[PDB]
Design a protein around this ligand. Structure first.
Ligand SMILES: Cc1cc2nc3c(=O)[nH]c(=O)nc-3n(C[C@H](O)[C@H](O)[C@H](O)COP(=O)(O)OP(=O)(O)OC[C@H]3O[C@@H](n4cnc5c(N)ncnc54)[C@H](O)[C@@H]3O)c2cc1C
Ligand SMILES: Cc1cc2nc3c(=O)[nH]c(=O)nc-3n(C[C@H](O)[C@H](O)[C@H](O)COP(=O)(O)OP(=O)(O)OC[C@H]3O[C@@H](n4cnc5c(N)ncnc54)[C@H](O)[C@@H]3O)c2cc1C
Ligand SMILES: N[C@@H](Cc1ccc(O)cc1)C(=O)O
Ligand SMILES: N[C@@H](Cc1ccc(O)cc1)C(=O)O
Lengths: 505, 505
């Protein structure tokens, strides 16, 4: 018979909720847990904002779209287990405008944006129209290996992880045997592929990004009708021990001089919570770094990983309109996204309100990196109440982006005066949007992040603690692996076998 | 004989005020200007926060310290022109603690922080105690050329501008003939030299940084007693045309069909302001990118520079204490700064309150880059009203850093309950702290940033538009050069000769 044991789950985002879900399913005798969440809200970076309780009157601030690819099977299994209402998500849609250098994209035209050397810009003529082809040449080998087997493909990709994307493109790969691109070529590739400055982060992250968004299998995409927070609701409801909100862990410790299994503790608001046999930390790493972890005696390079692994910013801005003018006036009738070099960068047309003719939400701006920091600087806790600079910027950018069909006056007139925006680097409980590692970090720092700690009783868990950054799948894989390690540590072979039987696939 | 002319100055930080100062001094017949400032406040990144009107009861949120080196002579000339009360600033002081991996630095100790491979960390033994020497070897040749002649030195440095600092250290310079360092060596150098992740930005910025902070001349440093905002006050006072605050420019244009000198205009709150013969934009580039600039017909690569040139974040946190416990109890009696891998990263002991025995301000945290974003996530426009996570974090970090003489209890007891913090990336009027360029940007994008525009009538001015990022000197040089180009364009030879006579040196 198993002795009584308690574990501690720090954070109630999807990782922490998944750990609890797995433990609840295994039903290990005399095992209990505490889940502590710093926010008044549960769900973390699963976060649907509802303007009203009307059917489609929402947008997803965090996770919103899911590609049905093999590496994400665990995510779709969670969806199935919790009865999520899935509907099609249109990554690409009809008639979505693309605007660069104040020109609209045109199929079959040489340099439609007029940015090549031939037209007075500095993008090389042989690059301006062929970003797709040239990035497929840069990323494709690795994408194919990842599709064959993600783990093996990842291990192969790590052999060039010392390079940034820019460095890879500049030098022609590891041996100089690939094409070499000049600064302006690489700049245009970045502009057409990702957020501002992100080619100066890891080549491996750009490859994995391309694998997820431009997967060789050309997958179907899905979203959750009613918002991703429906998943948080579902996971919360099954909990044998409910989330304790407004509980911010500020320290984690192990008492190595104590003989007991339950010799770990955490500190919350100056008070000790003790008796834990294992602690699963599931917070973003910036939050973890703020804790006093001296009581864990972490390897110094593991500590370095917590402080230094790079996070990217992300900002979303959603506006309500009295009618879906992008559908009715612009012929944008089935989702997709408009891309531009204007400040809003990306305008996402919702896939969940396609048949509505009344009030409708538009995800008017979705940005990463420096673009997100810049939009984020206009996003305030208490929005300007009386002129709102962000609203005016978004309306002006939307007018330019949809100029083939709309005017600023008509868009402003359709705008209801209700909007919401969110900058993830401004969230105290995350401090960024997600991990997006710098050069060398996956191959050098990440293995120390994942190093056993406190004699195998402390786990650093979450999307950053995975090879699938910025996806639910990374959070879930990280959680599963940590539960495996926990069961193994305490030699619970019956329940480890059960874990593999029920939860591996 | 000179026709009436009007110019527009966008922004009233130190660049904008300096343009006006020069124009006011040259007294060109029939020339006037408008200065439009978006904020209700004048001064921009010159910004002293006064807790009360008591003598030393302030800290500088922006610029605060000035090295007396030749390349910054124009800054000290501005100080002299305006009667600034300068006092000594102690960059290095006595008894300032350094805390890494929970160990305190001590001179002569081998691997005091226990991070060497020999002691179970991953920092190579031949690097751990010799970061200074190794970075001087990497930067030194260029620092010396910059000392001989900054312009010539810069031009030589541009020949390796394609590399990040990490890339330079990794590959052994451009030919592999310098020492090559592994990931963990470079990581430790970054940790000991700058903010988290900044070695993944331009090598040239790391060099120029080292040149300014560790100049070969071993300079005296100064600060302005009473706060840097005294300079803003003095510059405002002399203005022939006063700053117009709460005037945010949202568009800039030239009418090329009009034959007049004054064929430029700007838009503010939807209203046109016309008749300008030249427009000087002095805002941070993020603010400029948000404007509608179509009316200027900017070269596409100049537009790219505005969007893409990289900015770094910076955050400051200042606490008031009932007595200067760092002076009285820790023997830190003459300024300097404490450095640590704890979240606060750098604690700066003020140089302006050394003889005070009552209330005193401490610049408890000064951070850059990801460190600043993480502290910044706790800095709110409306500070939490009665528990503040940021305050508690700073108090706990201060206790650890000063554990040789203080306890948390004593520091908390000394804390008055009054503090202020500021994260520059969260300021709508800047959107970052300052330019800190990525690899290749100085050598490729920057020349297009500085390209003549609107037929020589539009100027992009400010610290980013200079080779001295993050210093007043960059702003002043940028302003001076733009005024030169303005006088040249309109062939005002008498006044151009006067500019050279009075303002070159
Ligand atoms: C803008 C954005 C868009 C995204 N898009 C998608 C998408 O389309 N599809 C997809 O699959 N994924 C997407 N992702 C990723 C997905 O949202 C995340 O990977 C996942 O939600 C992360 O879950 P987590 O449990 O690892 O971390 P979190 O969600 O961060 O959960 C950690 C929890 O810990 C809490 N916490 C923090 N500090 C403390 C403390 N001291 N004590 C106690 N608790 C604390 C936090 O409040 C939080 O609730 C997106 C993410 C973002 C930010
Ligand atoms: C944290 C920090 C520490 C620093 N430390 C030092 C130091 O120790 N020593 C040193 O010499 N230098 C230092 N610097 C640098 C120095 O502060 C700056 O380089 C200088 O103040 C920038 O002046 P500027 O005129 O170029 O830009 P800004 O100060 O940004 O002025 C531009 C003005 O334009 C306004 N504006 C923005 N948008 C609009 C619009 N649409 N319409 C109208 N107006 C607009 C802004 O509000 C602002 O007032 C520091 C800077 C920071 C942020
Ligand atoms: N997965 C998130 C964002 C993201 C994806 C991949 C990344 O590498 C980084 C961020 C989305 O759906 O937009
Ligand atoms: N000059 C600012 C900060 C700074 C200095 C140099 C840089 O390259 C960047 C930022 C200071 O005194 O702290």
């Amino acid at each position: 018979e198993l002795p009584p044991r308690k574990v501690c789950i720090v954070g109630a985002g999807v990782s922490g909720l998944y750990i609890a879900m797995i433990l609840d399913d295994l039903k290990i005798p005399n095992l209990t847990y505490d889940i502590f969440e710093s926010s008044s809200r549960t769900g973390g970076r699963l976060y649907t904002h509802h303007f009203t309780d009307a059917k489609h009157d929402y947008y997803d601030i965090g996770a919103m779209r899911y590609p049905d690819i093999p590496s994400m099977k665990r995510t779709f299994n969670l969806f199935k287990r919790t009865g999520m209402p899935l509907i099609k998500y249109y990554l690409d849609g009809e008639n979505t405008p693309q605007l660069y250098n104040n020109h609209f994209f045109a199929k079959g035209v040489v340099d439609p944006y007029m940015v090549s050397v031939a037209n007075g810009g500095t993008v090389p003529d042989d690059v301006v129209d062929s970003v797709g082809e040239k990035l497929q040449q840069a990323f494709g080998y690795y994408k194919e290996k990842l599709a064959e087997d993600f783990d093996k493909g990842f291990d192969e990709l790590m052999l060039v992880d010392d390079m940034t994307t820019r460095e890879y493109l500049k030098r022609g790969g590891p041996k100089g045997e690939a094409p070499k691109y000049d600064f302006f070529a690489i700049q245009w590739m970045e502009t057409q592929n990702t957020g501002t400055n992100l080619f100066d982060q890891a080549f491996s992250e750009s490859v994995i990004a391309s694998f997820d968004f431009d997967n060789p299998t050309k997958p179907e995409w899905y979203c959750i009708e009613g918002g991703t927070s429906l998943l948080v609701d579902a996971m919360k409801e099954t909990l044998v021990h409910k989330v304790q909100n407004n509980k911010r862990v500020e320290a984690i410790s192990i008492d190595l001089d104590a003989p007991d299994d339950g010799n770990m503790s955490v500190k919350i608001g100056g008070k000790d919570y003790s008796g834990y046999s294992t602690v699963f930390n599931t917070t973003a790493l910036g939050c973890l770094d703020r804790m006093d972890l001296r009581g864990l005696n972490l390897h110094p390079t593991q500590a370095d990983a917590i402080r230094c692994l790079h996070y990217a910013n992300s900002t979303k801005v959603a506006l309500k309109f009295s009618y879906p003018w992008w559908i009715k006036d612009c012929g944008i009738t089935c989702g997709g996204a408009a891309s531009t070099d204007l400040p809003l960068r990306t305008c996402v047309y919702p896939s969940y309100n396609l048949g509505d003719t009344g009030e409708a939400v538009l995800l008017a701006s979705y940005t990463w990196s420096q673009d997100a920091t810049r939009i984020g600087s206009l996003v305030k806790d208490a929005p300007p109440q009386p002129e709102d600079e962000l609203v005016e910027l978004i309306l002006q950018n939307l007018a330019r982006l949809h100029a083939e069909h709309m005017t600023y006056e008509k868009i402003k007139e359709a705008y209801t005066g209700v909007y919401h925006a969110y900058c993830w680097a401004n969230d105290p409980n995350v401090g960024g949007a997600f991990a997006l590692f710098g050069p060398g970090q996956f191959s050098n720092l990440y293995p120390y992040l994942m190093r056993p700690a406190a004699g195998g009783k402390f786990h650093i868990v979450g999307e950053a603690s995975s090879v699938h950054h910025a996806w639910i799948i990374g959070s879930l894989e990280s959680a599963y692996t940590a539960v495996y390690q926990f069961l193994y540590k305490y030699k619970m072979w019956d329940y480890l076998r059960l874990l593999l039987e029920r939860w591996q696939y």
